[PDB]
Amino acid sequence: SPVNKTLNRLTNDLLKEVVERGKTQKAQKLRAYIFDQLARRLEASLSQEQINDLYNRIRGTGDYTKSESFSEEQLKILKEKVVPELKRELSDLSNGNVNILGLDVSREDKYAFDTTNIFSVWFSNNPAVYMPQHVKTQVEKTAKLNQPGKTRIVFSSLCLNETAQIDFQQWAKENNIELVDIDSIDLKSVSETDAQLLNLAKDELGAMRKGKGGNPAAASDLVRWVDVIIGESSTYIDIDLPMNDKKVTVEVHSGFPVLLNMGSALTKDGQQPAMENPAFNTDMIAYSKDKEARRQIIEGVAKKIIARYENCAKYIEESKNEELVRLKNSPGYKLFVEKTDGKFDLCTLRAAVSEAHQDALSFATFFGAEYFAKTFATQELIPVIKEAIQHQNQDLLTSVIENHIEKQHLNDYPKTPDGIKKLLKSFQGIVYKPLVMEFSGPSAVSSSWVEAISGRSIPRNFEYLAEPMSQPLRVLQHYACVSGKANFSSDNIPKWCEL
């Protein structure tokens, strides 16, 4: 077919220009991808009238007697619009430029990092315990292995008793650990944005103390971005990350002043190269000795987190997290929003979602009657659960869940009203975690990174490109993440190009 031959020899021309020299016969997948893209993008660029002429040209119908190749105006759109754009995507360094929070990723070793100064965060939820022994052994082992360097731990003394405070200070002097009290930082000596983060973290820990929705993992999320806690150059790690066998040089360099942990998952696409989905995480964050460039990134991260704390209702409306969409449409949330008039603390919301899982009537009224029936019985109980919510029949609804425990033969959950609380609390985790992760945690933080590589065709792992650094993900992997730049590893996200 004439049109086929043109698309094929056009494909082959493009392949030879974007593929490593000598490796064109290893790029059969890219060849299939270029051909497929040339065809789709051309049709997507033609008018209906031009699409109808091509159909007649391929069939050899209409003004045509035999199957013909493209009309010249079709060939121009192909050669001048379609082919040059696909070339740019495969082969142009400009297409690989990544700009995060107003700063380019250098393809150079532009920013220095101290790999030996490490810090973690532990905010205790029990004023008598300053740190669980399980966590203590992790830090102790990490501190000894991070020698000769420094190992710091961020804590909050207002969350501990005098006994716990003295014993933490004592444990640390004995274990080469510097302790950083966030309640001991003069916020007037500190940047406006650092002041905001620290205040926000204290309020979270304060609401935790009063059991009014606060959360220590959220406070840990905040303080990692605080400039004064980061100091001259440091790497945040989660307290449970293993140290590597061989350490990397005490100084390393990369092309961005803030290195998150990153990877990608590959799904095979058959004859065509694999789709690649990047994963971003804050279990490991390296910060540069360049403090002016780092200030630009961490303040941007902070301002955006603060934006979400200041407009909870708006961001929950706008989230595409499906657990937040379930929450957004629950009767409980709608009543919660009309009572607060849309103006509420994130902590107030968490507290409300926590109280929903306290008894059956709460759970029934908050997440609806239809859900209750489907979770613990069938649709047919709907009219009865609706009238039970409306008359606050606590006992009925406990009985129905108790009935669910025996029918589905749930022997880790007693039929005591306490056993119901246990069962409800096991469900809370899935509607509660996004009220930490989507505001202060990795998904919220990673927004800036995801935006930076957005508005494009779905990334792919093109094995044999002449110019890898035209692909944003390849720029990210080599110049914008901790991979190769830290003495720690993690299972929390895939490795790069993990199958």
Descriptive notes:
It is a single chain. The protein is an alpha/beta fold and 499 residues long. Among the domains are: 2-91, no CATH class; 118-231, Spore Coat Polysaccharide Biosynthesis Protein SpsA, Chain A; 320-437, Up-down Bundle (Four Helix Bundle (Hemerythrin (Met), subunit A)). The protein is built from 23 helices and ten strands. The strands form three sheets. It has a six-stranded mixed β-sheet, with helices on both faces. Strands 1-2 form a two-stranded antiparallel sheet. Strand 1 and strand 2 form a beta hairpin. Helix 1 runs parallel beside helix 4 and helix 8 (192-209) runs antiparallel to helix 9 (216-223). The longest helix has 20 residues, at 72-91. The chain is globular.
Kindly report how far apart the N and C termini lie.
37 Å
Largest sheet: 6 strands, mixed
Structural class: alpha/beta
The CATH level-2 architecture of the domain at 320-437 is identified as: Up-down Bundle
| CATH fourth-tier homologous superfamily of the domain at 320-437 | Glycosyltransferase family 88, C-terminal domain
Q: Tell me the overall shape.
A: globular
How are the SSEs ordered, and which strands pair?
Blueprint (H helix, E strand, L loop, with lengths): L1 H17 L9 H16 L4 H12 L12 H20 L1 H4 L2 E2 L2 E2 L6 E4 L3 E4 L11 H13 L5 E5 L6 H12 L3 E5 L10 H18 L6 H8 L3 H4 L4 E3 L13 E4 L3 E12 L2 E16 L3 H20 L1 H7 L3 H8 L1 H10 L5 H11 L3 H8 L1 H8 L5 H9 L3 H14 L9 H16 L1 H4 L4 H11 L19 H8 L20
Outline:
With 499 residues, this protein is of the alpha/beta class. It has 23 helices and ten strands.
